[PDB]
């Protein structure tokens, strides 16, 4: 039987769970897929509210697992896995084994450079540049009996709003799509949405392919998908708890544990340099594991031909601390129930766990906040690392990994999402490395939480950085990074971030006994419950400072290139964001948004983001379990 839980917070979790699953609230599509947000006029990472993300699915798993903990019913958790596999993990039809089985482990992909401005794309493929060897593919095909990959594609157009349909039929739903393709300066406002399955039916003469990559001959019809590593790791994290909670009640989620273990096996592709170049010696092709940084990178992607048989896979050279998950690594490398079937799965994850904790410590600022990350591909072209730049195993420090518009590490959210995983690990194992990181990080954040007399509160929203960490010497360890500083630019009341923060502090307090952390966590949860509840969960009014880009952001299109979006929108040089998404004008909030822009005001919205609502729910459950009295 499961231990007793605090009745007050369990009830709050149960209430949120009901609001999230309530058909009248509209968090899910008719197929049972959760939307990024109830509201459709939404641009921030995805560019439409009713697309879904692997991030949303992993939060859906966490929510249902927690529900299973309190109700004893785990059919919902098993259902979240069923929906994931059916809709976000490309099936046999979406990534034909005929093409995947032609993959060549000695030549994973063809090199192409990355540019710091979208106008430099398409990027030219260069077969003469070296590419290392893929050491894990043989392990995976042997263990699973297929060349297809088992990982979640990161974004899905749930109701076929864009019109690409399924495998180019233009009418089926959901629809696999992708957006980001052109480097660090290509914000969510500067992309050209494209289908994952490109048969040249939409877009230009060769679909959307030659907008991004330039080859010698005619572009072939092809498919391609991109994984968001932190989402798949969260899925493993959530499944571990579901397993633990199910067993305390004599229940079983065996089938789901198997899916999560397999996903974690394939997730190892994020451990590798984009083109398998040796870590620390980017000019040389790797000979296998010497190309593994063992961190959860920004992504791993794969694709192949549709009418001809060939395929490729790439890792990523860019690493952000916000994506790490020491807990998932601990699970996959130590729990017998989650041991991957591949020969080196568990051991590789053991190496990743140690490497990840070194990464966090190397990046810990003088104050306590965690700095950006590192890359094995300076400027995305394996250029020489500037002299004076600090390094981590030969990789150069980057303040804002992968994206600069806006900086990927200027949002406070990354801090709590990532440190929450460190807190779970510390809670379960009492690991000294984790304790050291949290003692300093928790003292920093506890001094930045502001409670107002009227019950509202504020926490860091936007942050900035100065300096860099000292070069990492594994035998020396943390130097204190006296020249690395974080600065809080402004504060806000992001309910998702505040919930994740409460979660982190609760796990930490439960293990360390730190009263300050426990009372701040409870005050946060109470303040949100008492002052921000509405009929759909919780919400607050927030400013959408970037919405002016709906109308004034020009989207780059190569000279002479012309094409059409499924709905007829013309794609050509000169178009603005709204020009290739004209359906947005039929959105209920459109007129309101435009009226505000015309009056020179900043638009505001009251948003219900799926991950935020779940984050709040889960945080209540976690508190209920760790502080039953
Ligand atoms: O086709 C002929 C030829 O292909 C060769 O293979 C090429 C392939 O053609 C290219 O399309 C492919 O290009 C990849 C880029 O190198 C890479 O930079 C880009 O990365 C994007 C990713 O597409 C996108 O999904 C991802 O989005 C993330 C968001 O940024 C995050 O905010 C969110 O949280 O998570 C999502 C998901 O991670 O962003 C990244 C980074 O910008 O992906 C391109 C593919 O989509 O390169 C291949 C190799 O060069 C092949 O080798 C030849 O054999 C073949 O003939
Ligand atoms: O979605 C897949 C992808 O998601 C990544 O995580 C995203 C979240 O999905 C997204 O909701 C989140 O959006 C933030 C946004 O970045 C902030 O800028 C914004 O905060 C604003 C606020 O809106 C303003 O009112 C205020 O004035 O300024 C602040 C600061 O600009 O808050 C929203 C909601 O939290 O962004 C996340 C980071 O990109 C994952 O990282 C990735 O792994 C997933 O694949
Ligand atoms: Ca830009």
XYZ file of C-alpha atoms and ligand atoms in Angstrom:
731
model
C 0.000 0.000 0.000
C 1.125 3.573 -0.683
C 1.988 5.841 2.249
C -0.572 8.448 3.411
C -0.802 11.756 1.572
C -1.701 15.266 2.712
C -5.473 15.464 2.089
C -5.505 19.183 1.271
C -3.035 19.010 -1.613
C -4.244 15.647 -2.886
C -7.672 17.282 -3.312
C -6.064 20.162 -5.171
C -4.340 17.705 -7.512
C -7.614 15.835 -8.063
C -9.437 19.108 -8.826
C -6.815 20.142 -11.395
C -6.906 16.656 -12.913
C -10.670 17.001 -13.408
C -10.345 20.414 -14.997
C -7.619 19.205 -17.349
C -9.555 16.100 -18.466
C -12.937 17.896 -18.586
C -14.227 17.655 -22.222
C -15.861 21.067 -21.830
C -12.500 22.723 -21.167
C -10.975 21.600 -24.476
C -7.394 20.664 -23.535
C -7.587 17.599 -25.807
C -8.421 17.048 -29.477
C -11.119 14.571 -30.496
C -8.404 11.926 -30.963
C -7.311 12.300 -27.334
C -4.166 14.325 -28.021
C -3.404 17.241 -25.681
C -2.954 20.663 -27.294
C -0.057 23.002 -26.441
C -2.714 25.376 -25.112
C -6.481 25.753 -25.152
C -6.113 29.137 -26.863
C -5.253 29.018 -30.564
C -3.656 32.468 -31.049
C -0.349 31.190 -29.716
C 3.286 31.769 -30.776
C 6.355 31.160 -28.549
C 8.035 27.812 -29.430
C 5.315 26.183 -31.497
C 3.532 28.821 -33.647
C -0.092 27.653 -33.275
C -1.929 26.714 -30.102
C -3.472 23.501 -31.363
C -0.350 21.687 -32.485
C 0.965 19.273 -29.868
C 4.546 18.623 -28.796
C 6.459 15.669 -27.391
C 6.839 18.009 -24.416
C 3.061 18.028 -23.939
C 2.829 14.250 -24.260
C 5.506 13.712 -21.613
C 3.635 16.037 -19.227
C 0.458 14.102 -20.001
C 2.277 10.933 -18.894
C 3.428 12.561 -15.663
C -0.096 13.799 -14.943
C -1.722 10.386 -15.438
C 0.951 8.607 -13.377
C 0.199 10.952 -10.473
C -3.511 10.289 -10.993
C -2.794 6.574 -10.818
C -1.010 7.183 -7.505
C -4.111 8.670 -5.872
C -6.944 6.768 -7.565
C -5.327 3.381 -8.030
C -6.401 3.469 -11.688
C -3.534 3.396 -14.194
C -5.496 2.845 -17.413
C -5.083 6.554 -18.131
C -1.301 6.300 -17.892
C -1.313 3.316 -20.257
C -3.540 5.340 -22.569
C -1.119 8.258 -22.647
C 1.513 5.798 -23.896
C -0.855 4.352 -26.496
C -1.596 7.795 -27.911
C 2.105 8.660 -27.939
C 3.062 5.557 -29.932
C 0.183 5.862 -32.366
C 0.617 9.573 -33.121
C 4.075 10.934 -32.164
C 6.435 8.029 -32.829
C 6.571 7.617 -36.627
C 5.019 4.279 -37.584
C 6.227 1.788 -40.194
C 4.370 3.836 -42.823
C 6.002 7.100 -41.715
C 9.601 5.881 -41.644
C 9.614 2.867 -44.031
C 12.113 0.225 -42.970
C 12.925 -0.234 -46.656
C 14.699 3.114 -46.521
C 15.883 2.928 -42.906
C 17.465 -0.506 -43.435
C 19.722 1.056 -46.103
C 21.324 3.224 -43.416
C 25.138 3.068 -43.446
C 26.663 3.223 -39.954
C 30.082 4.106 -41.391
C 28.596 7.146 -43.193
C 25.614 8.312 -41.050
C 24.972 11.536 -42.962
C 26.424 14.165 -45.270
C 27.986 17.264 -43.740
C 26.414 20.682 -44.256
C 27.356 23.904 -42.431
C 25.180 25.936 -40.061
C 24.875 29.704 -40.539
C 24.231 32.565 -38.119
C 21.561 34.133 -40.337
C 18.549 32.595 -42.100
C 19.394 34.418 -45.347
C 22.441 32.175 -45.805
C 20.231 29.120 -46.339
C 19.883 26.768 -48.163
C 23.034 25.210 -46.695
C 25.181 23.281 -49.201
C 25.860 19.589 -48.580
C 29.549 18.708 -48.904
C 30.421 15.028 -49.321
C 34.147 15.735 -48.868
C 33.884 16.854 -45.249
C 34.500 14.022 -42.763
C 31.738 12.249 -40.847
C 32.407 9.778 -38.033
C 31.058 6.269 -37.438
C 27.809 5.410 -35.609
C 28.639 2.817 -32.897
C 25.151 2.173 -31.542
C 23.071 1.368 -34.605
C 24.212 -2.273 -34.674
C 23.225 -2.599 -31.005
C 19.702 -1.287 -31.703
C 18.865 -3.230 -34.864
C 20.100 -6.399 -33.166
C 18.032 -5.804 -30.024
C 14.806 -4.668 -31.692
C 14.911 -6.325 -35.116
C 14.280 -3.187 -37.172
C 16.069 -0.108 -38.510
C 13.263 2.296 -37.576
C 13.880 4.583 -34.603
C 11.699 4.648 -31.500
C 11.632 8.261 -30.342
C 9.063 11.059 -30.412
C 9.035 13.581 -33.267
C 8.762 16.913 -31.420
C 5.770 18.625 -33.001
C 2.446 17.598 -34.510
C -0.297 19.557 -36.316
C -3.133 17.761 -34.484
C -6.092 19.064 -36.464
C -4.295 19.598 -39.775
C -4.552 23.393 -39.493
C -1.667 23.871 -41.944
C -3.226 21.486 -44.476
C -0.357 19.084 -45.236
C -2.409 16.109 -44.039
C -0.800 12.704 -43.521
C 1.939 11.591 -45.906
C 0.931 14.338 -48.323
C -2.786 13.524 -48.598
C -3.639 17.022 -47.382
C -6.761 15.841 -45.554
C -5.870 13.413 -42.750
C -5.089 14.334 -39.148
C -2.916 14.510 -37.218
C -0.170 15.823 -39.501
C 3.606 15.519 -38.954
C 5.279 18.902 -39.504
C 8.489 20.720 -38.581
C 9.420 24.397 -38.456
C 12.945 25.311 -37.314
C 15.563 24.635 -40.016
C 17.773 27.705 -40.391
C 20.095 28.283 -37.425
C 20.390 30.338 -34.238
C 18.826 33.509 -35.612
C 15.725 31.795 -36.949
C 13.163 32.530 -34.253
C 9.732 30.923 -34.118
C 8.577 33.984 -36.101
C 11.027 33.452 -38.982
C 10.280 29.882 -40.058
C 8.419 28.336 -42.971
C 6.318 25.427 -41.651
C 6.946 22.320 -43.711
C 5.753 18.705 -43.785
C 7.924 15.900 -42.412
C 6.838 13.735 -45.340
C 7.737 15.736 -48.448
C 6.494 14.351 -51.756
C 6.804 17.743 -53.484
C 3.029 18.107 -53.441
C 3.005 21.373 -51.499
C 5.340 24.352 -51.470
C 7.691 24.769 -54.397
C 8.744 22.675 -57.375
C 10.600 20.357 -54.978
C 8.367 20.839 -51.957
C 10.147 22.799 -49.225
C 13.448 20.923 -49.437
C 15.593 23.423 -51.365
C 14.733 26.239 -48.966
C 16.979 24.557 -46.415
C 19.483 22.201 -48.016
C 21.232 22.421 -51.372
C 22.562 19.303 -53.085
C 24.191 18.672 -56.469
C 21.207 17.113 -58.203
C 17.427 17.168 -57.997
C 15.986 16.967 -54.454
C 14.454 13.561 -53.841
C 11.092 12.952 -52.200
C 11.931 12.321 -48.550
C 10.877 12.135 -44.921
C 12.665 13.364 -41.802
C 11.915 13.727 -38.104
C 13.461 15.530 -35.151
C 13.554 14.442 -31.532
C 13.404 16.750 -28.505
C 15.607 14.770 -26.045
C 14.348 16.429 -22.868
C 10.780 15.282 -23.662
C 11.742 11.635 -24.184
C 13.814 11.713 -20.981
C 10.827 13.158 -19.105
C 8.755 10.247 -20.458
C 11.214 7.838 -18.852
C 11.167 9.859 -15.625
C 7.360 9.800 -15.516
C 7.137 6.095 -16.330
C 9.523 5.252 -13.471
C 7.201 6.887 -10.947
C 4.127 5.257 -12.481
C 5.893 1.902 -12.079
C 6.841 2.662 -8.469
C 3.373 3.897 -7.560
C 1.651 1.008 -9.347
C 3.690 -1.588 -7.446
C 2.925 -0.025 -4.056
C -0.693 -0.841 -4.913
C -0.271 -4.274 -6.454
C -0.959 -2.850 -9.913
C 1.207 -3.063 -13.032
C 2.152 -0.865 -16.004
C 4.585 -3.417 -17.410
C 3.741 -2.682 -21.040
C 4.449 1.027 -20.605
C 7.723 0.332 -18.786
C 8.826 -1.577 -21.886
C 8.032 1.306 -24.222
C 9.873 3.786 -21.989
C 12.933 1.531 -21.766
C 13.051 1.168 -25.554
C 12.673 4.952 -25.978
C 15.537 5.464 -23.544
C 17.649 3.044 -25.589
C 17.211 5.079 -28.786
C 17.536 8.365 -26.870
C 21.273 7.625 -26.718
C 21.606 9.108 -30.221
C 21.504 12.537 -28.549
C 24.804 11.599 -26.873
C 26.609 12.100 -30.183
C 28.172 14.955 -32.075
C 26.000 15.964 -35.042
C 28.263 14.350 -37.645
C 30.012 12.030 -35.228
C 33.173 14.149 -34.972
C 35.511 13.453 -32.058
C 34.607 15.430 -28.952
C 37.343 17.983 -28.311
C 38.935 17.444 -31.728
C 36.125 18.572 -34.102
C 38.244 18.367 -37.272
C 38.524 14.580 -36.986
C 35.903 11.972 -37.829
C 35.118 9.816 -34.810
C 35.764 6.080 -34.663
C 32.738 5.387 -32.511
C 32.278 6.398 -28.901
C 35.024 9.015 -29.098
C 32.252 11.080 -30.725
C 29.963 10.852 -27.700
C 29.763 13.775 -25.275
C 27.257 11.718 -23.253
C 24.952 14.677 -22.638
C 21.359 15.099 -23.775
C 21.923 17.414 -26.728
C 19.437 19.670 -28.479
C 18.311 16.809 -30.751
C 18.894 13.769 -32.900
C 17.179 13.586 -36.264
C 16.710 11.055 -39.013
C 15.272 10.810 -42.490
C 15.325 8.862 -45.722
C 13.978 8.596 -49.237
C 10.346 8.002 -50.120
C 10.710 6.839 -53.714
C 14.321 5.613 -53.444
C 16.042 3.735 -50.597
C 18.555 5.553 -48.395
C 18.632 7.188 -44.972
C 20.664 9.158 -42.464
C 20.799 9.999 -38.760
C 22.430 12.894 -36.932
C 23.089 13.718 -33.322
C 23.773 17.269 -32.169
C 26.908 19.119 -31.146
C 25.055 21.674 -29.017
C 24.361 21.018 -25.330
C 22.087 23.021 -23.009
C 21.920 22.352 -19.244
C 18.167 22.832 -19.401
C 17.822 19.540 -21.303
C 19.756 17.317 -18.896
C 18.004 14.659 -16.832
C 20.306 12.946 -14.273
C 17.286 11.137 -12.844
C 16.361 9.457 -16.125
C 20.007 8.463 -16.501
C 19.990 6.986 -12.987
C 16.849 4.972 -13.790
C 18.037 3.509 -17.097
C 21.451 2.624 -15.681
C 20.524 1.198 -12.271
C 16.934 -0.068 -12.108
C 16.710 -3.643 -13.397
C 13.132 -3.057 -14.573
C 14.310 -0.262 -16.900
C 17.442 -1.950 -18.264
C 17.652 -1.351 -22.034
C 17.778 -4.490 -24.220
C 20.794 -3.245 -26.200
C 24.232 -4.468 -25.134
C 25.552 -1.067 -24.030
C 22.352 0.776 -23.137
C 22.622 0.680 -19.349
C 26.371 1.351 -19.244
C 26.169 4.306 -21.641
C 23.508 5.797 -19.401
C 25.813 5.238 -16.419
C 28.474 7.306 -18.166
C 25.901 9.975 -19.052
C 24.784 10.298 -15.430
C 28.338 11.109 -14.281
C 29.005 13.365 -17.260
C 25.732 15.256 -16.743
C 26.480 16.055 -13.102
C 29.928 17.321 -14.069
C 28.217 19.518 -16.701
C 25.865 21.114 -14.142
C 28.692 21.837 -11.703
C 30.943 23.303 -14.398
C 28.124 25.706 -15.302
C 27.163 26.832 -11.789
C 27.605 30.588 -11.475
C 29.103 32.398 -8.510
C 25.521 33.085 -7.349
C 24.076 29.623 -7.955
C 22.069 29.823 -11.185
C 23.174 27.461 -13.971
C 24.847 28.912 -17.080
C 24.081 27.894 -20.685
C 26.099 24.973 -22.007
C 28.745 23.971 -24.530
C 29.186 22.941 -28.136
C 31.518 20.668 -30.040
C 30.862 22.659 -33.219
C 31.849 26.313 -32.863
C 29.542 28.417 -35.039
C 28.052 25.149 -36.237
C 30.911 24.637 -38.676
C 33.509 23.036 -36.407
C 35.490 26.276 -36.455
C 38.384 26.999 -34.125
C 37.345 27.838 -30.568
C 38.424 31.421 -29.788
C 41.457 31.607 -27.519
C 40.410 32.375 -23.958
C 37.098 30.521 -24.270
C 36.485 28.089 -21.408
C 35.995 24.432 -22.267
C 34.347 21.276 -20.929
C 36.061 18.163 -22.300
C 37.270 20.176 -25.278
C 33.858 21.728 -25.944
C 33.594 25.504 -25.860
C 31.301 27.353 -23.464
C 28.284 29.020 -25.082
C 26.163 31.455 -23.105
C 23.034 30.810 -25.163
C 23.202 27.350 -26.829
C 21.513 26.852 -30.218
C 19.252 29.949 -30.273
C 19.934 33.669 -30.001
C 16.482 35.070 -30.891
C 15.820 35.174 -27.993
C 18.756 33.689 -26.071
C 17.973 30.086 -25.059
C 19.248 30.748 -21.550
C 17.623 34.112 -20.816
C 14.348 32.432 -19.721
C 14.211 31.435 -16.039
C 12.164 28.352 -16.940
C 15.201 26.278 -17.892
C 16.513 26.644 -14.318
C 13.574 24.906 -12.605
C 12.804 22.340 -15.286
C 16.358 21.035 -15.136
C 17.063 21.414 -11.400
C 13.792 19.631 -10.562
C 15.360 16.451 -12.002
C 18.461 16.993 -9.885
C 16.144 17.290 -6.861
C 14.429 13.968 -7.609
C 17.830 12.264 -7.897
C 19.004 13.814 -4.619
C 15.777 12.722 -2.943
C 16.143 9.104 -4.110
C 19.867 8.542 -3.732
C 21.180 11.270 -1.460
C 23.904 11.735 -4.093
C 26.595 14.172 -2.866
C 27.119 15.830 -6.241
C 23.403 16.613 -6.436
C 23.302 17.917 -2.855
C 26.185 20.288 -3.526
C 24.441 21.739 -6.608
C 21.095 22.169 -4.852
C 22.378 23.710 -1.605
C 23.816 26.572 -3.622
C 21.042 26.835 -6.228
C 18.234 26.729 -3.655
C 19.832 29.495 -1.577
C 20.010 31.621 -4.712
C 16.392 31.167 -5.803
C 14.906 31.409 -2.290
C 16.292 34.922 -2.115
C 14.591 35.839 -5.400
C 10.999 34.888 -4.575
C 8.825 37.900 -3.731
C 5.459 37.589 -1.987
C 3.116 40.598 -2.008
C 0.652 41.661 0.692
C -2.325 40.962 -1.573
C -1.396 37.329 -2.081
C 0.294 37.669 -5.462
C 3.974 36.903 -6.043
C 6.877 37.312 -8.425
C 9.854 35.163 -9.395
C 12.671 35.732 -11.913
C 11.424 35.863 -15.505
C 14.228 37.109 -17.728
C 17.889 36.694 -16.773
C 21.227 37.747 -18.208
C 24.825 36.605 -17.937
C 28.343 37.967 -17.582
C 31.679 36.178 -17.828
C 32.222 32.457 -18.254
C 32.922 29.418 -16.072
C 36.509 28.340 -15.403
C 37.760 25.561 -17.683
C 36.682 22.199 -16.318
C 39.361 20.007 -14.751
C 37.640 16.760 -13.619
C 40.268 16.202 -10.944
C 40.058 19.759 -9.580
C 36.288 20.014 -9.636
C 34.223 23.131 -8.958
C 36.349 26.276 -8.578
C 33.368 28.411 -7.594
C 33.336 30.240 -10.932
C 33.943 33.665 -9.370
C 33.817 35.320 -12.796
C 30.503 33.794 -13.928
C 27.491 35.861 -12.878
C 23.735 35.733 -13.388
C 21.593 38.877 -13.357
C 17.814 38.920 -12.976
C 16.585 41.375 -15.619
C 12.889 41.320 -14.672
C 10.361 39.406 -12.580
C 6.998 37.944 -13.474
C 4.312 35.491 -12.488
C 4.732 32.586 -14.886
C 2.528 29.930 -13.269
C 4.259 27.077 -15.071
C 7.703 28.170 -13.895
C 6.380 28.851 -10.378
C 4.882 25.345 -10.262
C 8.073 23.675 -11.459
C 9.951 25.749 -8.856
C 7.615 24.553 -6.082
C 8.241 20.969 -7.239
C 12.016 21.427 -7.092
C 11.969 23.011 -3.626
C 9.640 20.329 -2.254
C 11.867 17.400 -3.272
C 14.899 19.281 -1.989
C 13.272 20.210 1.331
C 11.976 16.679 1.895
C 15.537 15.351 1.671
C 17.593 18.165 3.223
C 15.205 19.384 5.903
C 15.569 22.979 4.688
C 12.503 24.719 6.154
C 12.923 27.837 4.012
C 12.537 25.748 0.859
C 9.532 23.881 2.216
C 7.643 26.995 3.260
C 8.401 28.826 0.015
C 7.156 25.801 -1.946
C 3.904 25.675 0.040
C 3.367 29.445 -0.124
C 3.816 29.272 -3.902
C 1.275 26.470 -4.267
C -1.198 28.222 -1.941
C -0.840 31.617 -3.606
C -1.496 30.038 -7.004
C -4.478 28.033 -5.754
C -6.057 30.917 -3.864
C -5.434 33.816 -6.235
C -5.114 32.415 -9.754
C -7.708 29.661 -10.068
C -10.329 29.771 -12.814
C -12.777 27.248 -14.249
C -10.105 25.704 -16.492
C -7.218 25.414 -14.036
C -5.136 28.465 -13.237
C -4.192 31.528 -15.241
C -3.135 35.148 -15.087
C -2.988 38.011 -17.555
C 0.335 38.269 -19.340
C 1.829 40.603 -21.902
C 2.699 39.276 -25.351
C 5.550 41.649 -26.130
C 6.578 39.854 -29.325
C 3.169 39.732 -30.978
C 4.004 42.774 -33.121
C 6.065 40.301 -35.180
C 2.787 38.769 -36.422
C 2.628 41.786 -38.716
C 6.147 43.177 -39.003
C 8.410 40.114 -39.131
C 9.668 39.515 -42.639
C 10.327 35.866 -43.464
C 13.373 35.131 -45.621
C 12.774 33.314 -48.898
C 15.633 32.708 -51.387
C 15.761 34.879 -54.514
C 13.676 33.362 -57.301
C 11.998 30.760 -55.083
C 8.182 30.746 -55.189
C 5.671 28.289 -53.760
C 2.294 27.860 -52.101
C 1.101 26.734 -48.681
C -1.745 24.170 -48.867
C -4.366 26.932 -48.401
C -2.996 28.904 -51.343
C -0.836 31.418 -49.455
C 1.984 32.460 -51.772
C 5.527 31.995 -50.467
C 8.034 34.432 -51.930
C 10.535 37.072 -50.932
C 8.836 39.851 -48.992
C 6.204 37.882 -47.085
C 5.567 38.564 -43.417
C 4.752 35.988 -40.735
C 0.994 36.419 -41.196
C 1.282 36.165 -44.987
C 1.951 32.425 -45.017
C -0.543 31.730 -42.198
C -3.550 33.749 -43.383
C -5.974 31.413 -41.563
C -4.887 33.108 -38.337
C -7.123 36.009 -39.328
C -10.194 33.861 -38.590
C -9.003 33.293 -35.012
C -11.485 34.595 -32.386
C -8.741 36.668 -30.718
C -7.328 38.121 -33.953
C -9.316 41.380 -34.068
C -8.614 42.000 -30.378
C -4.884 41.461 -30.895
C -4.677 43.720 -33.969
C -6.729 46.468 -32.298
C -4.163 46.584 -29.493
C -1.254 46.772 -31.918
C -2.957 49.590 -33.840
C -3.390 51.579 -30.632
C 0.304 51.200 -29.870
C -0.405 48.897 -26.929
C 1.123 45.554 -25.970
C -1.405 42.744 -26.445
C -2.287 40.675 -23.381
C -3.640 37.157 -23.054
C -4.927 34.805 -20.388
C -3.364 31.492 -21.359
C -3.876 27.867 -20.387
C -0.763 26.032 -21.561
C -1.107 22.263 -21.124
C 2.346 21.764 -19.626
C 1.792 24.604 -17.142
C -1.516 23.236 -15.870
C -0.001 19.748 -15.504
C 3.071 21.210 -13.831
C 0.806 22.830 -11.228
C -1.225 19.662 -10.729
C 1.868 17.476 -10.349
C 3.477 19.957 -7.956
C 0.430 19.670 -5.700
C 0.659 15.878 -5.790
C 4.373 15.850 -5.020
C 3.832 18.094 -1.987
C 0.934 15.938 -0.808
C 3.168 12.840 -0.857
C 6.354 14.278 0.656
C 4.678 16.313 3.406
C 1.626 14.216 4.466
C 1.296 15.956 7.833
O 18.132 14.957 -48.589
C 19.296 14.660 -49.350
C 20.487 14.350 -48.454
O 20.106 14.646 -47.086
C 21.209 14.550 -46.165
O 20.722 14.777 -44.885
C 20.558 16.128 -44.424
C 19.090 16.550 -44.603
O 18.772 16.664 -45.991
C 18.832 17.883 -43.914
O 17.444 18.187 -43.987
C 19.274 17.823 -42.443
O 19.105 19.078 -41.871
C 18.999 19.177 -40.433
C 19.886 20.334 -39.946
O 21.251 19.968 -40.103
C 19.614 20.693 -38.472
O 20.271 21.911 -38.151
C 18.109 20.842 -38.201
O 17.906 20.981 -36.828
C 16.693 21.603 -36.327
C 15.513 20.612 -36.421
O 15.150 20.433 -37.778
C 14.292 21.113 -35.640
O 13.297 20.096 -35.605
C 14.698 21.481 -34.219
O 13.607 21.985 -33.535
C 13.708 21.963 -32.098
C 13.435 23.363 -31.550
O 14.501 24.233 -31.918
C 13.324 23.318 -30.033
O 12.957 24.604 -29.541
C 12.281 22.284 -29.621
O 12.232 22.214 -28.240
O 12.664 20.994 -30.101
C 12.715 20.933 -31.541
C 13.118 19.523 -31.911
O 14.431 19.238 -31.450
O 15.700 22.493 -34.263
C 16.917 22.003 -34.859
C 17.989 23.055 -34.639
O 17.692 24.252 -35.334
O 17.432 19.658 -38.631
C 17.541 19.449 -40.051
C 16.600 18.323 -40.391
O 15.277 18.643 -39.988
O 20.663 17.480 -42.374
C 20.948 16.181 -42.932
C 22.430 15.940 -42.745
O 23.174 17.092 -43.127
C 21.816 13.135 -46.207
O 22.971 13.086 -45.375
C 22.180 12.724 -47.643
O 22.613 11.368 -47.663
C 20.962 12.898 -48.556
O 21.308 12.586 -49.901
O 7.182 23.181 -27.258
C 8.229 22.275 -27.570
C 9.498 22.686 -26.871
O 9.102 23.524 -25.776
C 10.207 24.123 -25.092
O 9.664 24.798 -24.001
C 8.978 26.041 -24.289
C 7.488 25.970 -23.880
O 6.798 25.048 -24.714
C 6.828 27.359 -24.009
O 5.521 27.334 -23.449
C 7.652 28.416 -23.286
O 7.093 29.664 -23.507
C 7.495 30.701 -22.599
C 8.302 31.743 -23.358
O 9.536 31.174 -23.773
C 8.586 32.952 -22.474
O 9.198 33.966 -23.259
C 7.299 33.489 -21.842
O 7.624 34.455 -20.903
C 7.438 35.845 -21.239
C 5.995 36.257 -20.905
O 5.103 35.657 -21.836
C 5.827 37.777 -20.956
O 4.541 38.134 -20.467
C 6.897 38.449 -20.103
O 6.779 39.831 -20.205
O 8.191 38.081 -20.583
C 8.446 36.672 -20.433
C 9.876 36.428 -20.876
O 10.009 36.606 -22.279
O 6.638 32.442 -21.134
C 6.256 31.346 -21.983
C 5.464 30.376 -21.129
O 6.275 29.838 -20.099
O 8.981 28.423 -23.797
C 9.659 27.183 -23.534
C 11.110 27.374 -23.914
O 11.259 27.440 -25.322
C 11.228 23.041 -24.614
O 12.432 23.673 -24.198
C 11.568 22.029 -25.728
O 12.333 20.947 -25.207
C 10.283 21.501 -26.349
O 10.571 20.604 -27.411
Ca 16.044 36.492 -36.091
